[PDB]
Amino acid sequence: TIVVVATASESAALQYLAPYAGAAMGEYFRDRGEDALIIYDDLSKQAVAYRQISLLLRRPPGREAFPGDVFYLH
Amino acid sequence: MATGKIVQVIGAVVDVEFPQDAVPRVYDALEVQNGNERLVLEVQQQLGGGIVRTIAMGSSDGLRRGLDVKDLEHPIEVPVGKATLGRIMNVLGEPVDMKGEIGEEERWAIHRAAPSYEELSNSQELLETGIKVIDLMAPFAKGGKVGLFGGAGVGKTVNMMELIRNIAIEHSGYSVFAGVGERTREGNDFYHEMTDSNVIDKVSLVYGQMNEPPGNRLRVALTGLTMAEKFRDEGRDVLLFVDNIYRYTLAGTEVSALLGRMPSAVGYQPTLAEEMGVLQERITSTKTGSITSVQAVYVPADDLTDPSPATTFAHLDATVVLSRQIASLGIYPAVDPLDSTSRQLDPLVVGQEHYDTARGVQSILQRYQELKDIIAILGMDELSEEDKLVVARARKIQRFLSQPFFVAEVFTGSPGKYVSLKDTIRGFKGIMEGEYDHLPEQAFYMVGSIEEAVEKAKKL
């Protein structure tokens, strides 16, 4: 296993980015012809970190104040 | 020559400033070099003086302020005609199957007006699908619209694959498939199922995948509609498959939230019903040709009451209701025969024989649903001898309207069967009248015509 950590005190951008960093490590094995398995623990917390980032940038809030592009995020 | 300059980038939304004399009109396609890649923008709004507000069709990463923008004085315009058949294209009409260029002859813009009520052709010619339950319980005519309502995992996508195959190597007419909000795994499975089943040469595929900007997913339905409208103009009776309307409404919600429009009843966009109308009003039969259509509709959290399924109901002519309970029993296709309906199911257009057969099937199944709890509490040996016959006949009907699909073979290994409407009516009309009270129940499970039922019982 590889463990990627972005704790509750990290900057919101490091929580938002952490799943893409994990995916970037999983793809290294995938593109070679090996099998990997990646667990994203709490995508809902990534969505809360991205909501915070998008609300501090004064972007138009959607439903439950989430930004419009949370689908295009996930 | 390029004359605009980028002045903002906020996510997928880009603002471009032009000289006051040359401002691009709404829905014009702009073009910019996102490094070595070529990015087009669709003009959404003319706000303020000389500024223009746009959605990027490709991804917006790498854009910087001050880039030069060339305005193509046409909307997004795509290749059409025979040349499209058996290719895969994206919303921009660029190939993604790597088979080289499309080799077009003509291009049409994706935005155009719907036919007027005077040009419509009143028609009642029923389509003949290869599927027993759909032919019997929910017939639909050319130019009509069919909605495959259901949850997740019930069989909408494989039902549409079966329809494409049956209406591509039984009736040899062309077909167009617009995968708005497609899953790349399912799109590749579709491409390989159609290439293996030899039907690929009569299907035109457009994909807008889930990992693309919202407006890129939104426009794709209009791209597939524009291809079906080219084929209609040639006099064909085309058939248009929309892979999920719910994801079209979600893409519209996303695009509308990005532009900062004030949201609506459930956070949906304000223009929800006008987008649905602009989509569904172009799909009609006309005096020259026709576009028939079937649309998969995902119902979120199992309610027909929220704005998306509630607003699409107004346009459909037939509604098929799929259920995961029936599928989990192991019966496919998992159509609920009691809740699926059609506007065309009346004696005057289907004939009294078809209407009577359908109403009798529904009555038998309703009576069985009544008797089920008396059977459960009392036990079957207490039922009256005519009710002990309704039970068996309903149980055989409930088996017989399952069917093996040609595309489900990779799930089951057994071969598929195509059943004509005549054989469907003959089978159900025979079962209800007791001509087959001597066969086991399992003689009807996953068979084609009733002849296969008698032959399986003879083998069983």
Next chain:
Amino acid sequence: MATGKIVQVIGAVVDVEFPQDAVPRVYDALEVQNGNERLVLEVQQQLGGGIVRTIAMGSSDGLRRGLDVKDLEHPIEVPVGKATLGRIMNVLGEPVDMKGEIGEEERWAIHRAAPSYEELSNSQELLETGIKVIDLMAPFAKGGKVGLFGGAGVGKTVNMMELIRNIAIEHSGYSVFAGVGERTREGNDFYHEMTDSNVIDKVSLVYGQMNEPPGNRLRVALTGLTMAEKFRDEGRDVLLFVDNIYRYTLAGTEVSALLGRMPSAVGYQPTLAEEMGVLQERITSTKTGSITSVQAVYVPADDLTDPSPATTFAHLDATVVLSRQIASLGIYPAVDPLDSTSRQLDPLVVGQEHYDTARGVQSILQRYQELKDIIAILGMDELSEEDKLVVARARKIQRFLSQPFFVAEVFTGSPGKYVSLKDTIRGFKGIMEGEYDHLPEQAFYMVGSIEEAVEKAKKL
């Protein structure tokens, strides 16, 4: 000396203008002569023009715009260490009892980074509490986090006072109590209980009770946690009691709108989860020392799904959930055993007998919950002769979970009882397998071990 001027005053927040070459940093303290008193501002933002947004650590009334303010070039700093033990302190670290100044040698900034990942430590050492339900259902370890969830008037503070009595007196190391936005009456009654028990020499006290303006309530939890961190770094092991953590987030919500931040889901600041995690992550045990902590966590309108409870639940190790329904029964402690849990309720940590007893109690209390709706409509007579047995045992369990407390000895006259872990598992295992089927339900209400229930049965 004074180098800046007030330019706005909106309630609790103040805007101050400085020369652009001398603008303070983003957590420095500032000082203002408010009338005759001295008011401290903590800067929260740097706006563009040498202006700065700050929160007033005191009453904001009387502030004119145009007052001179003085730039202290260091953050808020509080006394820390041995010197601060038997004393009560302000949020600014000032002494609030009428005794003299604090004799500290060292002062710490209240904004600090959480310990690194390689520096943490985890312990399985189960800590025993006198309370039958808490250690049976939700046993917690030395150096773990306990959180008590409940609405208003359900028992959070009485239970925290029982935990203080049962662990914190027969415990060696020092202790820290932070009152964050609760009653001054209860803080005075606690301080006089400690001073009349001669244990005050071990309990450092910080108070920012609900009469104070938002800044004191906001910072007071951080200044109490700083003192706990200092005692942890000396190599000791420490108890930290926080009397309502919810008030920290609420004071942040009250301030949030004035700081010009767009509101979120239910009004809360956008930064709710970061504001909570920045405090919660640094209250932890490390390889040099351990902090054992009990937090009361008010849940507004009894809504366990309100964002603040929902985002608090992830931080804790043992969560005890109080409920108003059970308290309305009069069954204190009003723990809901179907919602309380612990990280430590595993057979390898607790042992198989404890784990099985706790799971059986949960299973039959869940089965009784499932019966309650049919008992409400039809009535009990319809149940199976099996179902009535699990209902009778579940009701006897619900009574036996109650316990009298030495601190509740003034709301009821009953003497307090201390029940060991062995006796509680011995009694619950006895009840579950029916060896006490013959006693009435009232024999179990407000008793200690089961041998007191068998005695109470004799007296009815």
Next chain:
Amino acid sequence: GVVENLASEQAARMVAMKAATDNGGSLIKELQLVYNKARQASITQELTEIVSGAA
């Protein structure tokens, strides 16, 4: 003794179904109160999101 017990059965079922109908009628009141609170909270949480979203 069998026929008297059978008439006792019919009368006991009559009384029991009467009581169950009154219990249902009380549970309607309690559920309708909870429904009213839920729909009020939904109206306000939506209209507040809309109004606060418009900068």
